[PDB]
Design a binder for this molecule. Structure first.
Ligand SMILES: O=c1[nH]cnc2c1ncn2[C@@H]1O[C@H](COP(=O)(O)OP(=O)(O)OP(=O)(O)O)[C@@H](O)[C@H]1O
Ligand SMILES: O=c1[nH]cnc2c1ncn2[C@@H]1O[C@H](COP(=O)(O)OP(=O)(O)O)[C@@H](O)[C@H]1O
Ligand SMILES: O=c1[nH]cnc2c1ncn2[C@@H]1O[C@H](COP(=O)(O)OP(=O)(O)O)[C@@H](O)[C@H]1O
Lengths: 296, 316
């Protein structure tokens, strides 16, 4: 019995909504392909209950899913079964505005309306790109995009596959941007930190192994730049096994994880992917040079 | 997998809505008992899709369910599973303003707004009646009540268990009220396939339902307390509906359709069904129940009395 009990009412509307739309979809046949209208489509539902079902949900809310057919197909191409998606959002409240499902499998980012319009500007070319690389990419994997309205105010969310493992605790994080400026991390933010370009540079961390990652990444960033996208960051995460199976993951679940070489001094397993692709040609080149210097 | 395909957008919406509300109800705990709020509660949902899922449902529709919890409770008390109710409304479209679920189990009537209000005025006492008789009534057994909005316009629908058997064909039917007034089936009506015969048609035909003692008392006591209850609510125009099933005729019809290549029933399911007396001429099976009870106010005391004195000797 999916009681939608959450940390705050918009989370329970989210759980209700993802549940509702995913069931709805279970009743819609998967087509032999997607169509232009599928990229201009949306689901909208409005709930006014009165003295009924109020114990955990609101009595008045709205839920809109953008291009449900396209995002369900994306879900299939990324290897996510729909009822696993549904279970991870609905079994227990998402946690911590940026959220993870209770099982650390997916992240739910609160997003500006400009970003929703950017998603619509790109989505056909993004889908064909997922098609052409058979999902082997490092761009964020978009699994749904929703708009919740509750108590009056609208909120936009983009669900995506987590860059990090849902199992192995990540021990250090770096948001590399390739800046010609010097994006360092704040003393305030230093006191698990988030290190940017200058600090992975003046830290001495290297990543050891092999090279087909460079093929995947360069394809991704040539694509993003060929679409006037900027401000994206490559996110890197180190898990030192030694802290205390260890360095044990399922490469079909953590599709971004990667094992160290015997070279590596510490016992490390890495996770890496591109993030924040919703908003310049020089950006791609500088970004790629800085990400080049990183391997051993 | 449910397409909700149907001949009319209205029916598709009815299937979608019964599905949605039963599924929503699935996640709501079953209370220890009902609070008064539940008797003035409702659940609305308004759908407006766009370029999505329009093969059968309209893009734009609304669906309201009344006192969903007391009708869930009623369903329980009437021995109907929520899953079953949902499936017989959604597995295939209902058929023929009146509707029947594909499996001939439940009936969906289009009613007025005032019928809805009248059901609301009486619902609290009706639920306590159904409670204090364990679901042993001739009264209609109300399973849900809804309000659909297709293409801008509202339709009110009341779901009820069928007085007729889902298996056993009905060969003759009567609608009786005990009116002093000459109530007879029109020459237009008297010439349908299964005509709906009124009182005079029952009398000029000398029809006698012969059920034998024990079932005759179940019936007479049920009818007595049912219509006393209806009277106390100042409710009128209710009819007793009786369908006659010809056992031998059905045996023959089945034989004639099996050539184209028992006489028993479940009172768990055909709740208004009664067998004919052992020493009876034709082996028949009857279905008898009161219907059309959502109309408030000679006096309704008088209507109770005349109705009862009539149906008292409809059978013997
Ligand atoms: O809870 C109730 N206790 C008693 N009586 C009720 C209750 N609930 C409804 N009634 C009556 O039930 C009829 C159907 O009317 P309705 O309300 O379902 O339709 P709305 O008025 O909302 O009009 P709308 O602006 O949405 O087009 C109207 O006599 C309405 O007073
Ligand atoms: O997939 C993820 N798993 C865990 N944390 C993430 C993930 N994606 C982003 N984050 C966290 O949220 C931060 C903000 O990233 P993003 O670049 O998308 O926001 P921005 O638009 O302010 O630059 C990331 O640097 C990281 O701290
Ligand atoms: O449960 C049922 N099973 C089969 N027929 C029914 C059932 N309920 C109603 N009917 C048919 O519908 C007719 C009209 O019933 P009712 O008196 O409730 O509607 P009304 O508002 O037109 O008078 C009944 O006389 C009977 O012919």
């Amino acid at each position: 019995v999916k009681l939608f009990r959450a940390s705050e009412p918009i989370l329970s509307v989210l759980m209700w909504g993802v549940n509702h739309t995913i069931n709805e979809l279970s009743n819609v046949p998967v087509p032999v392909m997607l169509m232009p209208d599928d990229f201009k489509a949306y689901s909208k539902i409005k709930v006014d209950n009165h003295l009924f079902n109020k114990e955990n949900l609101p009595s008045r809310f709205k839920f809109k899913e953008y291009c449900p057919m396209v995002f369900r197909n994306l879900r299939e191409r990324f290897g996510i079964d729909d009822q696993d998606y549904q279970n991870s959002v609905t079994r227990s409240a998402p946690i911590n505005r940026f959220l993870t499902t209770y099982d650390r499998r997916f992240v739910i980012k609160t997003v500006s309306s400009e970003d929703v319009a950017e998603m619509h500007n790109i989505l056909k070319k993004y889908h064909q790109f997922i098609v052409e690389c058979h999902g082997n990419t490092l761009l964020p994997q978009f699994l749904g995009m929703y708009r919740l309205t509750v108590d009056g105010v609208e909120t936009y969310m983009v669900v995506t596959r987590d860059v990090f493992s849902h199992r192995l605790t990540v021990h250090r994080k770096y948001d590399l941007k390739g800046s010609t400026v010097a994006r360092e991390a704040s003393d305030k933010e230093k006191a698990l930190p988030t290190f940017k370009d200058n600090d992975f540079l003046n830290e001495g961390q290297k990543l050891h192994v092999k090279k087909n990652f460079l093929e995947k990444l360069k394809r991704d960033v040539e694509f993003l730049a060929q679409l006037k996208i900027m401000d994206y960051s490559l996110l890197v995460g180190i898990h030192d096994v030694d802290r205390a199976g260890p360095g044990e993951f399922d490469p079909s679940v953590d599709v971004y994880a990667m094992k160290s070489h015997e070279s590596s001094p510490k016992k490390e397993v890495y996770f890496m992917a591109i993030i924040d692709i919703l908003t310049p040609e020089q950006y791609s080149k500088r970004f790629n040079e800085f990400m080049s210097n990183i391997l051993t």
